[PDB]
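Researcher: Can you fold this with zinc ion in place?
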Amino acid sequence: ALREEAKGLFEVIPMQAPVTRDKIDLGAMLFFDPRMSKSGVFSCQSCHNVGLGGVDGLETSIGHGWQKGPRNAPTALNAVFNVAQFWDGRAPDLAAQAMNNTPENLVATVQSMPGYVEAFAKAFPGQKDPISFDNFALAVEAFEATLITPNSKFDQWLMGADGAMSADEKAGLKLFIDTGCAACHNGINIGGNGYYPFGVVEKPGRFAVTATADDEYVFRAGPLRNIALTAPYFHSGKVWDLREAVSVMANSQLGATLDDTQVDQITAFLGTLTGEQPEVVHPILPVRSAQTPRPEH
Amino acid sequence: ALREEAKGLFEVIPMQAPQVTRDKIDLGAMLFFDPRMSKSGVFSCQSCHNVGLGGVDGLETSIGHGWQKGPRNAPTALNAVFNVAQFWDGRAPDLAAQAMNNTPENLVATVQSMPGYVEAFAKAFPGQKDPISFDNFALAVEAFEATLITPNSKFDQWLMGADGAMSADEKAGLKLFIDTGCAACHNGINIGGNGYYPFGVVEKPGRFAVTATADDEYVFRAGPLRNIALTAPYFHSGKVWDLREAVSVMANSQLGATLDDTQVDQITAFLGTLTGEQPEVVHPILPVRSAQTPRPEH
Ligand code: HEC
Ligand code: HEC
Ligand code: HEC
Ligand code: HEC
Ligand SMILES: [Ca+2]
Ligand SMILES: [Ca+2]
Ligand SMILES: [Zn+2]
Ligand SMILES: [Zn+2]
Ligand SMILES: [Zn+2]
């Protein structure tokens, strides 16, 4: 019954997200290559650490031009299923929207390595110039599709394991749904679908939720899957305790009066969204050449 | 014959270094890949000793150890366990006895604060009132590091009898390397990483040169050349990016001898012969943090 209701609001993470191999292998390399960053110190992996729930464990960091400022890095895990992929911005901008190393540099970098040259060859069989920014992205994309975490306790229960979750955890599921959370944090990723004119801020609880300066400016209701592994929380990454994050959100213009037990249960439910982490072998990155652009410095 | 001579100056990398001994490696892997072991929470050993980048960070310099005398080019972790001289430079005396922020207190605390690390240390060290001690912490990391060895390089193969594992040029580079005097400092199982010398490559206001240190008391380590083809840039400053040039600035110095273009090319050709099979390493799943886990810097 509750499952019937839950089934109407969420989806489970599939065994595998919807060349292919060499396409993934190329992506893995690019994803783990720090030379793809202007400074040569950051690789996707650095901030979307596959060993840390696909995050960097820091309050904030900066790695994309679109970024509106230092933001808490979201997990790469299951990120492929997100329809809303940004933290914040003006609604119009974000709708049409969906650091330094220009596509020129990237292509050059990749271009400069024999390993990458043959790697792109395998990944894209009949192209005269398989080394193109677009393919570069597609490859990384392929790999990212690999970073999914199926079989979370929640997914198990959703599929029928009446005993996959505890009483409290189910109570948290009901309260989560009933309290209004699911209205923004839904979908296969329990979030990552839409933006809202709200953001959590620290006061000079130490944090509150306040409307954006303009209703047109919005923040993304992030995917809660694996959240137990992606601390700190909120765009600022200032709240480190999951229980408190649930709390600052429950007790706000967004949720409703919730008691300590109730809060505890929703957060208990949230821990239920941690899925089996991808086992990823660190790829052996191709050797650099004299033509390979040197790191920032 | 040349092999007989080479066999007297170097050793091949073993299939496995001479090291629970599994639960220790696994624990080491985690610590090695855990960025929370750094004060700022952004650097893990892996960050600067990237197992995908010949165990280096690919930067001119970086800073990650208290003993460091200043920004230095990060050496590969690969085969590092076989090095007897493990520092870049310093005063001979200091270095003899000697062998960033997060104090051993913090580390132990950090590890201590995670249930995963607690059970991981348990498996790694079956007996102890507190298996979670800085010493064990190091021992575990050490265990893993012993895993980061690159055997079967073309050179090792040839040393083991494969007359055809190396090319003519590469063998010429081996003879030149030996004959020119390189092997005098760059020898051992790692073709270096054994001793320090009163010389350092400095950028001239070639564009670099081997200069004697201010005082012969102060010395720089003749680093291991294995996998060097993968560990650019070169020298303590990490200012030379081309291997061929590194060979050159060193050949054309008091440490080397007069080598022409082909000779230099051959020595550098030989050096590429030291790249061994890279360790296939699965990125470990780091244990989750707790409320007691020290928060990152900032
Ligand atoms: C130095 C930090 C940093 C690096 C390096 C970095 N990222 Fe990110 N990434 C972030 C931050 C911060 C965000 C979220 C901020 C925002 O959207 O405003 C993010 C978000 C993302 C997202 C969207 C997540 C979601 O849930 O929709 C993807 C996909 C992503 N990064 C991919 C990559 C890839 C691929 C690379 C390597 C080319 C990379 N990142 C490198 C910091 C980084
Ligand atoms: C009006 C829309 C809305 C509703 C309803 C809502 N949220 Fe959110 N939630 C957001 C937005 C927007 C963010 C991100 C903004 C930020 O980080 O400041 C967010 C972020 C979060 C985060 C942080 C996730 C992370 O990865 O850091 C948690 C936890 C959360 N919400 C829990 C809940 C819970 C529990 C409820 C129900 C009591 C709820 N939310 C209801 C809009 C909503
Ligand atoms: C931010 C940079 C940085 C980080 C993080 C870092 N290292 Fe290093 N490491 C270096 C540099 C630079 C050197 C060489 C400098 C010197 O010796 O003066 C080095 C050298 C070493 C060496 C000796 C190499 C040899 O060939 O003898 C070992 C072993 C080592 N690091 C282990 C580690 C371990 C284990 C960690 C994690 C606890 C780690 N490093 C983290 C920068 C770093
Ligand atoms: C007198 C001792 C000595 C002799 C002889 C010597 N080297 Fe070195 N070599 C060093 C020292 C010390 C360093 C490191 C100092 C620095 O980086 O400035 C070094 C560094 C190097 C490096 C850089 C390694 C790296 O990882 O960055 C290369 C390459 C090198 N030597 C090649 C050679 C070659 C080729 C010869 C023979 C022509 C040779 N060396 C002879 C002392 C010596
Ligand atoms: Ca977070
Ligand atoms: Ca180097
Ligand atoms: Zn903010
Ligand atoms: Zn409570
Ligand atoms: Zn210097």
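Model: Folded with zinc ion in place. Chain B has two domains: 1-15+150-277, 16-149+278-298.
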